């Protein structure tokens, strides 16, 4: 049987309900003195400033009176992926490429900042109608090359990108995916036949 169980939402439709914590579970009478000895703190429907927002709009919360005016705690999560910013001069000097238009590079970087370097999302959102068609490897190559060049110009070191290896990897994956059911069945049949051959060889070696 299973040693431990793993699931995201819940393991099965037959799952027992979660146990919620609560007082008074053993009856109200036994906890009468405990509940009666104290009084609840006041809660308010109050506006709160979120410093992560740049506009300054005020939304409303259910919070204790003492918490009024405190900094919003979820604003600590607000941090974007570091992406360099370059001037027209810096691009003309270092980032110029006959294969890439400047407006195209700016669009790529805008998408990169919008989608936190999720290059698959950048490829899906890439404006193939206005600019030239680009593969995700081309976008990654351009981004990493520009980042390396800007770092070397300004200032540490970063690993270089290998577009060719990624292209070969995707090509191999696509070839492995497009194969017919017969070809994959043949691959598994060869795997099992090789395993049985090796097993017989190992048995003969063990006998010797």
């Amino acid at each position: 049987m299973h040693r431990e169980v793993y699931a995201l939402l819940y393991s099965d439709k037959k799952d027992a309900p979660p146990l919620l914590p609560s007082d008074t579970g053993q009856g109200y009478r036994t906890v009468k003195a405990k509940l009666g000895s104290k009084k609840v703190r006041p809660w308010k429907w109050m506006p709160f400033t979120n410093p992560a927002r740049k506009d300054g709009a005020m939304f409303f919360h259910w919070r204790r009176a003492a918490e009024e005016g405190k900094d919003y705690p979820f604003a600590r999560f607000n941090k974007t992926v570091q992406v360099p910013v370059y001037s027209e001069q810096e691009y003309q000097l270092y980032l110029h490429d006959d294969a890439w238009t400047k407006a195209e590079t700016d669009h790529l970087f805008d998408l990169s900042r919008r989608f936190d370097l999720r290059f698959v999302v950048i490829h899906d959102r890439y404006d193939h109608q206005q600019f030239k068609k680009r593969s995700v490897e081309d976008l990654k190559e351009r981004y990493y090359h520009i980042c390396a060049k800007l770092a070397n110009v300004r200032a540490l070191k970063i690993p270089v990108f290998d577009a060719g290896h990624e292209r070969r990897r995707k090509e191999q994956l696509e070839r492995l995916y497009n194969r017919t059911p017969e070809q994959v069945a043949e691959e598994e049949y060869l795997l099992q036949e090789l395993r049985k051959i090796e097993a017989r060889k190992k048995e003969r070696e063990k006998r010797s």
Binding site: G36, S37, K38, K39, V40, R41
Partner: peptide, 20 residues
Amino acid sequence: KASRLFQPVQYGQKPEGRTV
């Protein structure tokens, strides 16, 4: 009864013994 002589204390505050 205790409530007739003493204030209940707010949660998170140390009891001190304030009367009505």
